[PDB]
């Protein structure tokens, strides 16, 4: 199992 | 930031007048303390985008 994510958050 | 750009350039508003309060018979209203008083000033100048705020030439 290789569940992975590359998510970025930017405050506004 | 964006809001402050409105008041400076030209935005202008006018509110309701000032009216005195009457004191019924048999009683007297509290004191005022003279803290927020608008003294009457004579003259008829310019107001509301008709007034130039460019620095005086001195």
């Amino acid at each position: 199992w290789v569940n992975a994510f590359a998510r970025w958050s930017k405050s506004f | 930031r964006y809001k402050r750009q409105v008041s400076g350039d030209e935005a202008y508003l006018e509110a309701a007048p000032l009216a005195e309060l009457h004191a019924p018979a048999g009683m007297i209203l509290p004191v005022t303390s003279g803290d927020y008083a608008i003294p009457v000033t004579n003259g008829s100048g310019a107001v509301g985008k008709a007034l130039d705020i460019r620095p005086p030439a001195q």
């Binding site: - | 930031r1 809001k3 402050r4 750009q5 008041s7 400076g8 508003l13 006018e14 509110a15 309701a16 007048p17 000032l18 009216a19 005195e20 309060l21 009457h22 004191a23 019924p24 009683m27 209203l29 509290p30 004191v31 005022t32 303390s33 803290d35 927020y36 608008i38 003294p39 000033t41 004579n42 003259g43 008829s44 100048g45 310019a46 107001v47 509301g48 007034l51 705020i53 460019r54 620095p55 005086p56 030439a57 001195q58």
Partner: protein
């Protein structure tokens, strides 16, 4: 990065004025700052400082305008065109204030500045607009007090409500927001069963409306 060459101050001033008329302000801030730094004691340093006030104000650098105004009023307490500086200070305070439920400290500062202006030089050219702004600020503060009193009416605290309405009557007696607060004080008195005060408030209400 907005570099300024070593041109004579006359051409710099003329170009700055032309752009000011056109409607571009950021350009002349660097120019005037360079002129001041290179010539801290030029024959027209006061005019340089005044133009700095104007450029900072119309370029949205309010803190710099405040600091420069403070320094100027420190250096020259008797300059002939000193009412203009106080008027600009009031405008800067109003711009910072920029919505009657928010903190009114900037409004208080602006009211103080305009009060000093009007009491100082009654025959100037900023007096009419000064009073027109003073009435607006007075109404703003009265409405802030009214909002606080209304919230405390919702909460159920009546001592606070009566104290705040008394303060409003004592401070801002001739504003519209004060006429709409008398029913609140009458209700607060009645809820506590102080019927004599409620009767007096009713007498006051019926004598105007």
């Amino acid at each position: 990065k907005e570099e300024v060459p070593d041109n004579p101050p006359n051409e710099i001033y003329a170009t700055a004025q032309q752009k000011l008329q056109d409607g571009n302000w950021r350009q002349a801030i660097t120019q005037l700052e360079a002129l001041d730094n290179r010539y801290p004691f030029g024959p027209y340093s006061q005019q340089v400082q005044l133009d700095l006030i104007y450029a900072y104000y119309k370029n949205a650098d309010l803190p710099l305008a405040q600091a420069a105004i403070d320094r100027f009023i420190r250096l020259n307490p008797t300059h002939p065109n000193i009412d203009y500086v106080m008027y600009m200070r009031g405008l800067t305070n109003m711009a910072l204030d920029d919505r009657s439920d928010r903190d009114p400290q900037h409004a208080r500062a602006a009211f103080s500045d305009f009060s000093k202006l009007v009491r100082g030089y009654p025959n100037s050219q900023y007096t009419t607009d000064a009073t027109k702004r003073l009435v607006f600020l007075k109404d703003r503060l009265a409405k802030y007090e009214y909002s606080v009193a209304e919230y405390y009416t919702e909460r159920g605290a009546w001592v606070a409500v009566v104290n705040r309405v008394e303060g409003m009557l004592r401070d801002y007696p001739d504003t519209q927001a004060t006429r709409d607060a008398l029913p609140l004080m009458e209700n607060a008195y009645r809820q506590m069963q102080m019927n004599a005060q409620a009767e007096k408030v009713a007498k006051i209400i019926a004598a105007n409306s």
